[PDB]
Amino acid sequence: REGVFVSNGTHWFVTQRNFYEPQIITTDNTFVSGNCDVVIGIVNNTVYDPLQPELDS
Amino acid sequence: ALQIPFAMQMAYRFNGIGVTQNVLYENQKLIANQFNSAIGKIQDSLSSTA
Ligand SMILES: *[C@@H]1O[C@H](CO)[C@@H](O)[C@H](O)[C@H]1NC(C)=O
Ligand SMILES: *[C@@H]1O[C@H](CO)[C@@H](O)[C@H](O)[C@H]1NC(C)=O
Ligand SMILES: *[C@@H]1O[C@H](CO)[C@@H](O)[C@H](O)[C@H]1NC(C)=O
């Protein structure tokens, strides 16, 4: 939504552009648009949905 | 200077005009072909008239 996706070599994170602050990639950090096939240079990773542990209570 | 992939730099420059990033990545070949064509018109205009 704001910032950029970045990898430390094995994990994937999202960070603001002008200062490195790695956050776990989640549905409130990101927005969906369309299927995987269109974007050149896309990568596979988990996106954490923060509601699921709440429903699992 | 900080390196960044040019397709992601254009996604930031789209995001700077109120157009969402995915509008570029879903159209990246079109945007590249429109730019390459437009630079061709600059060459031909400058060759055509002083
Ligand atoms: C990358 O981040 C994870 C976060 O848990 C860490 O375990 C790992 O050591 C970091 N470095 C590399 C090279 O993966
Ligand atoms: C980056 O370019 C290399 C060739 O220089 C290519 O093998 C690779 O698949 C490309 N990766 C992406 C993410 O476009
Ligand atoms: C991404 O993950 C899907 C499902 O596992 C798989 O079909 C696809 O080939 C993967 N792409 C890459 C580049 O690994």
CB within 8 Å: B8 and A39? no
Q: Residue A33 is nearest to which of B5, B7, B26, comparing CB atoms?
A: B26
Spell out which residues of chain A touch residue B25, defining contact as CB-CB under 8 Å: 38-40
- DSSP annotation string for A17-35: SSS---EE-BTTT----S-
DSSP 3-state of A3: coil
* Residue A30: closest CA among B10, B20, B13: B20
CA distance linking residue A4 with residue B12, whole number of Å: 9
* Residue B15: closest CA among B30, B5, B25: B25
Tell me which chain A residue has its CA closest to the CA of residue B15: A2
Final resolution, Å: 3.3
List the determination method: cryo-EM
CA dist list (Å): A48 to A35, A45, B20, B26, B50 = 18, 10, 22, 24, 59
Contact B22, A33 (CB under 8 A): yes
Order the strands of the A4-7 sheet from edge to edge. Answer: A4-7, A12-15, A23-24
